[PDB]
Amino acid sequence: LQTILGGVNKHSTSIGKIWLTVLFIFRIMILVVAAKEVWGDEQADFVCNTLQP
Amino acid sequence: KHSTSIGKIWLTVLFIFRIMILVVAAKEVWGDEQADFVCNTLQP
């Protein structure tokens, strides 16, 4: 992770640096740390008022 | 009192016929009308 982030960051402009942190700490981190477990039981807790298999 | 042939024979026989159907056969056909009423739902 550090190697990939360091390499990509070096070959970037001023806007490329502010874009890089937005992509990582606010998109990858949120999806990995918070969002993934929110969708854990999407089908398990899907409840339908029916008796039809 | 002053009934004709159909008044006291064909009308009394048909009346007994309806009672016989009701008590001997028909009543138990309707025995489980609600017990065997089945709906596809989970709603109490």
Side-chain angles (χ1 to χ4, degrees):
Chain A
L1 293 192
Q2 183 267 300
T3 299
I4 328 295
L5 261 81
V8 176
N9 165 57
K10 285 155 49 63
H11 309 65
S12 305
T13 165
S14 167
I15 291 310
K17 295 182 179 303
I18 190 96
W19 179 95
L20 189 122
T21 178
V22 166
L23 178 98
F24 173 109
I25 195 71
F26 281 124
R27 306 179 78 177
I28 297 185
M29 215 43 33
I30 274 146
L31 165 145
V32 157
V33 166
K36 225 174 145 83
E37 52 182 23
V38 168
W39 273 260
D41 57 30
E42 34 178 38
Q43 203 181 192
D45 297 31
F46 195 71
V47 173
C48 293
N49 191 345
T50 195
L51 268 180
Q52 179 66 45
Chain B
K1 299 282 99 184
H2 288 355
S3 58
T4 69
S5 69
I6 82 194
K8 203 50 188 56
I9 308 172
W10 269 110
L11 268 186
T12 322
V13 156
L14 284 188
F15 186 74
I16 291 160
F17 180 113
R18 284 138 102 203
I19 299 187
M20 284 321 291
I21 299 311
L22 197 55
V23 313
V24 154
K27 154 286 197 194
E28 163 286 308
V29 168
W30 272 265
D32 53 36
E33 44 193 346
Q34 193 173 229
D36 279 282
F37 195 71
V38 172
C39 296
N40 191 344
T41 193
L42 270 188
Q43 175 70 43

